[PDB]
Subunit: 386 residues, 4 copies
């Protein structure tokens, strides 16, 4: 009955089930969880692995000794459970020093500190077996127009990413980078606010092959965009290195609900696309159990993330395998969208009278697309009402 197993590749950040519930208007409602405990509880629920920011695992300001101790305990829990660590990232947003950014702070000294903190964590990530290193520039941006010259900030962001690429290359590490966009919050506007802006920026780096995107459901939805469409563009470009799954109810603060909550039809189309395209990376959940819940509610919320993905996978698979759907797809000319417009070439197109001089515009215009019937088949499959 929709039971996950390590083979489904479900992963969770330590900061997700570990969120204590502090919000802009309130104090924590839950005590802090030890990372060893989260690993054990997640393994029992059927997850494949966990991810972390540097500061989730090693308290900021830790001595070298304390650091070694925290890592050793964590590595023991991984060995005991069989859990993996497929991705890691850096906290460049909590401490007051990062109030104006990490890579793009106006103060040069802060920029140099941000790169050193990042490099230290790349070494750790490699040691633990991570394949992807994410960067979410949550403090890179502004609340007012004069505060940041965006051209100079993009020069600084390029310079930081180029140096990180030089580092991994020189060390011979087998790790790639993934930038995670977000349009706003905590800054008034954040730089590289969507998947499109991040894809475009990557093409100006020195070694573009090392970088991809880590899109998050709720972030593109904070800009009112279609998440499955943005993911299709990232797959088309060959840059979907990792993904963050959650839920969001429209354009407002970043809710981070469990996956399946928020826009349920967009979750269906997302799973349809990931499974059809054969995405083989982790199915990672960046969510926050609501502050109304106790620990029992934390684990129920985490289990619901995986359950919802498995129900949707079943429904999308049933939709694509139904002969009546296959027929409707041809009725709506999805097979013709996949054929080249003009494999014959430009000259042939130019000489083809059927393409212009003798094209019957009225006959073509009268042809219904039959999209509503197709979408009702998709609705019936989602609801299990076939």
């Amino acid at each position: 009955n929709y039971q996950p197993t390590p083979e489904d590749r479900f992963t969770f950040g330590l900061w997700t089930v570990g969120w204590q519930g502090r919000d802009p208007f309130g104090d924590a409602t839950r005590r802090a969880l030890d990372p060893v405990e989260s690993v054990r509880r997640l393994a029992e629920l059927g997850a494949h692995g966990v991810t972390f920011h540097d500061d989730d695992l090693i308290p900021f300001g830790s001595s070298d000794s304390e650091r070694e101790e925290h890592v050793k305990r964590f590595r023991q829990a991984l060995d005991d459970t069989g859990m993996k660590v497929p991705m890691a990232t850096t906290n460049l947003f909590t401490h007051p020093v990062f109030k104006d950014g990490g890579f793009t702070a106006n103060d040069r000294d802060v920029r140099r500190y941000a790169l050193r903190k990042t490099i230290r964590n790349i070494d750790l990530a490699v040691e633990l077996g991570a394949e992807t290193y994410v960067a979410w520039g949550g403090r890179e941006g502004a609340e007012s127009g004069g505060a940041k010259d965006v051209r100079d900030a993009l020069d600084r962001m390029k310079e930081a990413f180029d140096l990180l690429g030089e580092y991994v290359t020189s060390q011979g590490y087998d790790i790639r980078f993934a930038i995670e966009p977000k349009p706003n919050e905590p800054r008034g506007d954040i730089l590289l606010p969507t998947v499109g802006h991040a894809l475009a920026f990557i093409e100006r780096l020195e070694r573009p092959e090392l970088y991809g995107v880590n899109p998050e459901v709720g972030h593109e939805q904070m800009a009112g965009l279609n998440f499955p469409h943005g993911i299709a563009q990232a797959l088309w470009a060959g840059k979907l290195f990792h993904i963050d799954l959650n839920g969001q109810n429209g354009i407002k603060y970043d809710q981070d609900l469990r996956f399946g909550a928020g826009d349920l039809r967009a979750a269906f189309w997302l799973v349809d696309l990931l499974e059809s395209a054969g995405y083989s990376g982790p199915r990672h959940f960046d969510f926050k159990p609501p502050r109304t819940e106790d620990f029992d509610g934390v684990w129920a919320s985490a289990a619901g993330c995986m359950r919802n993905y498995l129900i949707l996978k079943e429904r999308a698979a049933a939709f694509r395998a139904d002969p009546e759907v296959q027929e409707a797809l041809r009725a709506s000319r999805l097979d013709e969208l996949a054929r080249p417009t003009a494999a014959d070439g430009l000259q042939a197109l130019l000489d083809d009278r059927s393409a212009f001089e003798e094209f019957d515009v009225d006959a073509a215009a009268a042809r219904g697309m039959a999209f509503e019937r197709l979408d009702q088949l998709a609705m019936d499959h989602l609801l299990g009402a076939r």
Copy 2:
């Protein structure tokens, strides 16, 4: 008193002052304007030139004879007034045949027709002296998930743009292309919905040098994004080939108000950036005088577009030239944002103890950025309250 002249490079689409006022819920409130009349009236107000879609100038379905007649009359009005035609574009959205798109319609025959209609208008544009050809794919998109496989639609959109590039190259034309993004309306979601998504797509075309963006104030604002920030990224990439200026009041239907209306502080920061970066293309207005107005109100609205740009230019120039502002910019470390983070190189950074081991995080964190004082100077300059 803020009087424009042809030297200010102000341009208008024929469809702007010529909008009859038909909306989703109502009939036209104004009669149609002859293109010759719009040219004469615009020249008297101090504009530099006009732009057009194919169907604005030559009624759809026109015979070759009728076509020649419409062009001749238009060329006479240009000669009489000294007006130029710096940009042209194609209508691939009004006629029912384009109900599912032009370049990405599911029907292959429609796709071939869309390319032939486009090519015919490129020839005309060159004849009239246009330097930029815009493409706004208003019907490229969907209302439901199953209707369009986005990967196949991006293959089709790439194929269309590649063929157009082959055409201009083979003909030896001196024209470049600019894609205009929009997130939604008239389709539920439109492909390449923002400046970022369009920049990323260009990098996958066969001859990327021929293509840039034509961003529009109100379109990025329909996604709640910061317009000046998106323009700074387009300038950074060297792709701001043209721009569409107007106003919009937040996330809702595309209003196309006159420039200066809507978000007035964003208009200030936009003019600040265009003038500082030395953008030298046309200052084009894609706006609609509200359907409440008669002809007198049409021309008042058009004149207000240019007046508002000139007032803002004066205020931004006064802001940048004020010694007290120059001092505040240094107080907020804008001069340090423009210096390289690590011109010393990676190894030097790695060996620098002042960047990590001996960096005083608390001292750096306590430093105020003094952004509020700077933003109040910007406010006083905008309001002429210095």
Copy 3:
């Protein structure tokens, strides 16, 4: 298999299935439908009745003779099919005369014309057996601040509604009024933009008992509000006289998709509330089949509206009847929300030491609400995955 019957009280506006597909950027894609044909087709699909604006039934400018002829033909189709007409409304938005509003136009003569056109249609509505008369003030509003003094416009809107109430009372008609809010489109901002603003305005009319609201799913969603919450406030006030069902994908132009499309979880909670509260009015659909469709697609879209309501009704009923859900509701203290806070009275509350002096705040704070488990039960029921 989810087959509707006249007993389900499904109704449709003539303008819904009859929308020809003209949008802000394109021409009609379908021919006009005769009202007699729509009545027959709807009856075959299992609808209960239709609704109309004056201008949908009688072409604007019709002579008295032509008017009588249009009504007679329509009454014959109703008799032939058994369809009813439970609601009617007035078109005060299409004709250019209403460009600045009907009831709140700045020109006094237009205001008087708007009331006379309305009164003429109230008489017709009564003749046809309508019980509710809707008013949607789509042109009441503004694009700029100085154009409308809102206090004076609310005086004018009150004056119009008071006169209509005096008319129905003097004639002894058994009809009530329902105001339909919308936040924007076609005006920049519309007056009484949400269900809350309309409820508040009704309390200032001379005979408040005659007026209620006609909320529409997609309109409250254009303001990013929770539709089921707004409907619960209208039911609490005893003012839900009628409802408009459809779908909308967030904050953008008014899409009017078929019911069930858009926010599917909000559609579930809406049906849950209407059926639990025992709403007994019409289940009316104000939707537009997309312009991509031919006539076959029109009727498929209309049938999907009713199918989706019946699937959701089944799922909501199964949720409320499940013993495991009833248990979860008590676990989350929904039974305690329904009990009075202080039936004991103010003095007793003041004297109760358990309410303050001896209240254990920490013990109460530690209690989880168990909302995530309850919401996952709701998800499983919606998806038929119990």
Copy 4:
């Protein structure tokens, strides 16, 4: 040069200049300010008074002794500076006990505690001379549909407000209540989400005369609504008891920028309306100096709030006094909007052939409203470019 004085009635919450800078993603960047220090600094800048939540003045959990000490120190600073305390409110959102709400928590015991905490602070407010007591129900709402039955929650919210009214009446206090709406954040959806919903709810209380609204600029803007329009409806109803002034950049998290930031044209129209209507309550600022600033930046931000109001007041006054504007207002028929539609009565309207039978619809439709010229005069006045 736009210097405020106590006569301008500017007020600030202790929590505004006192915000330490903790956000959903970061730690505090400033130390806590003693309330006595804020009073002194505000008085030097020209403010009239301050406001507070219970917990801003008396740390939660304080003994009776500690409480008396905190009040005495505060009363001394008021005496020393001449500052007044025109409004007070209750914190029913920070402590974990309020995680599901105060007045509408599902647990009955929490509801009774919320009322007792409120009553204790009403007594204090009266002692300090407050005339208005605000209620912002920031935790009243939900993240999921099943968690809260909205009808029962509105019964509970009515019961709480009725008990508070009984309390003030029985004590003979001269204080009125003002409810402050907000659409979301920190809850997924908050009950009474806009000014309209709060106005409608007041009409169902036992003694409606005791309650009004406290609207906040940025909250209505989080729903994409027009703030000046909502304020005009509150003034029309006679319910604008207090106001919260700040700035917000569209639909996103609640920014609380300084007044004048965000939507500058909406700030102009707001000041125009408050001064024309003769609003005589406090001009209160609920804002947060950005976490990028040190203490110097805090006071600069606070001073900019008052400066911006005074510049806008001057510009709005100049607009209304300009003979050319007075002429444009008549050209746009603002004088006719203020005249009754039908002071002649219903029968006279019914018998008036000029209102329908002989009304020339085409002539009336051709009349331009001349709104664009009027809005450009408003723009020139705002910018000081007359």
